Symmetry: C3
Subunit: 275 residues, 3 copies
């Protein structure tokens, strides 16, 4: 389906499963699309849930607008979607950049919209190194990403999934060429301007205040060998700021562990959704 937001942007979404099922809403990372969740959507569908996933503005099949590439607009786009579908008691699961979108939307959501949230390999509290965050990554790492994306996006999108994203640069790791090709295809369908601008939106936005307002139970899951969103500056810190958080650490797993190790993660997600 599609949902039109307040500035006229059409957002594409998938909505599968029982109309009466408990809604599980998935928020993809950068620079991907709702199709990055195939495995988890089939999994949750098989357990009877209703599964919903949208393409962020400028990504996948959604429109490619000139503006709105920032976390507040992203969270507002989610609210347009959940209001259009009139979702109640949904579970929101966000990966990477999508975990920041989830944190901001759940902090601002209308009552009864959300029951639980899951932040997987997520960006909060804040990634960039600063006064307030001495353990963050320097701005130069993100300048690098911006410069390579602008210069030859198609090559940059082979390098990322080939190296750090799924940990395929680690000696002995089982490599899947299909995961590399699929990441590149999802990224090439989206907009160069949205992908370029989103880098600053995921790495420089402070979600500390958002996390402080979340009162529903939150599962915080992260792999310890994450080469994209450093584990120590994210997971433990987010868990400490949330009122009702469960922290799960997966030794040796990468940033895209939902696709490389779904047999480890999926049972832990279903347990939490059922608790």
């Amino acid at each position: 389906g599609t949902v039109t937001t307040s500035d006229g942007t059409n957002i594409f979404y998938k909505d599968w499963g029982p109309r009466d099922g408990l809604p599980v809403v998935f928020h993809h990372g950068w620079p991907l699309s709702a199709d990055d969740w195939d495995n988890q959507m089939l999994f949750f569908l098989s357990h009877g849930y209703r599964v919903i996933a949208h393409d962020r503005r400028g990504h996948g099949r959604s429109d490619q607008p000139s503006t709105g590439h920032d976390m507040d607009t992203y969270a507002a786009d989610v609210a347009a979607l959940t209001e259009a579908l009139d979702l109640r008691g949904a579970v929101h699961i966000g990966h990477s950049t999508g975990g920041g979108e989830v944190a901001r939307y759940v902090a601002r959501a209308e009552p009864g919209r959300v029951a639980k949230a899951v932040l997987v390999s997520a960006v909060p509290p804040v990634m960039v190194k600063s006064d307030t965050n001495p353990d963050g990554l320097p701005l130069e790492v993100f300048d690098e990403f911006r410069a390579a994306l602008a210069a030859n996006r198609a090559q940059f999108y082979i390098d990322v999934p080939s190296g750090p994203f799924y940990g395929f640069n680690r000696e002995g790791a089982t490599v899947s060429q299909g995961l590399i090709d699929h990441w590149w295809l999802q990224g090439m369908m989206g907009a160069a301007n949205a992908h370029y601008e989103c880098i600053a939106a995921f790495s420089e936005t402070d979600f500390t205040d958002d996390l402080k307002r979340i009162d529903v139970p939150v599962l915080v899951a992260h792999g310890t060998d994450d080469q994209v969103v450093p584990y120590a500056d994210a997971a433990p810190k987010s868990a400490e700021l949330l009122a009702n958080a469960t922290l799960k650490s997966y030794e040796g797993l990468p940033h895209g562990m939902l696709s490389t190790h779904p047999e480890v993660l999926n049972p832990d997600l279903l347990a939490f959704v059922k608790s």
Copy 2:
């Protein structure tokens, strides 16, 4: 263009060639799209035919609805398109799973809408082993496709076209990386739930009754080294059940022979459409 079906699903279709030419409609297999017919669409166009091809629901550029992944809905979606275009005297060509859709649509079509039909490498009568079909394939063959698709669809869709679909695993075959990569792209564009559910629809639906209902002339074509839809349980059985069928056997050709050997097949399809 697109056509809206009774449940509100939008179906993408192509319609090229003279508006008054005889219509030849192409039905793609699993898990592809209308783009699998490029070669045959240009070949028929060059002989002055009007050439139509749609993306099955949940495939290519069509919508990805929650339900309707079954042969009865697929044939009703075909009727929705042929009614919107008001086709008369059309020739329907179906490959693989599209051959099952053709058999069911043609058996139920309003009289005058169809002139002739062609089943290439098609699934009928019935693939799976049952009480009525002991030479069929065991269910476990299909349970493996389901499990590989659900675990890592992007890698499973490299594995199928690299191996059995086009016979590139046979010694001495001509391998085209282009055919592999195009199969993968068309597959990854479609929906994971549609592709998953379709496996039961193409392999367990019994088309025996549809086949007994068809009265127009039917060309049944099939490669004898078909590693996806086994030759002996399909083509000769279909031809024996159809009132007016012509059986064409192609020694040593694979399941995707319309793309690996179009120079052999195209003239034979053409002869049939002109007869």
Copy 3:
């Protein structure tokens, strides 16, 4: 965004940047899409311009109509778009086949619509060999393209970008696998019939009279080792026929130079637009 033309064809386009920015409109080459301009769009956006690029009919995300695959229609589709956006004083940049479409559009544009144009590695004045153009390429070259495209588009779309398009067949060239894969993707998304018919459109159309009617400043840029649109029969001839043209030759650069050497071409495009 999308605009519907007067024959009902939908054309997709992107429009990014300030609303009061001078409009720089990009016209991609054969058989590509608006996405071929990612580098140049982010570059001009970073200098405060509004940047616009559409998918030619039968290409990329635009519809795939039966007809209209000719330069007169391509220039009327551009007129339809610039009227809908109400562009005034735009700069039109065209690559390859897109440079012929820019010449035709600019020659017929309404008063006030165009300020300047840029023809990069463009097809004017006329490619095909004849009595009028003794240095053209023989019709046989384009007949081979037609034949390879119709036989196996998927494989021909790997061969073109792998050999001649980007000069990767030259000893010592730095090959980018992402450039190859992206060319192929953009090509496979477009229509086989449009791509096939466009070959005659770009190689056989004589743009001599179009060039003689253009009176705005025109930059004619061309690589001297262009293996798709030979330099000697294009750039110098176009520059002689234009009233106010600046010719820039790039020694040893390929047809795809905007993507292989953007650090060389982008400065020159910007200096032309600021002049």
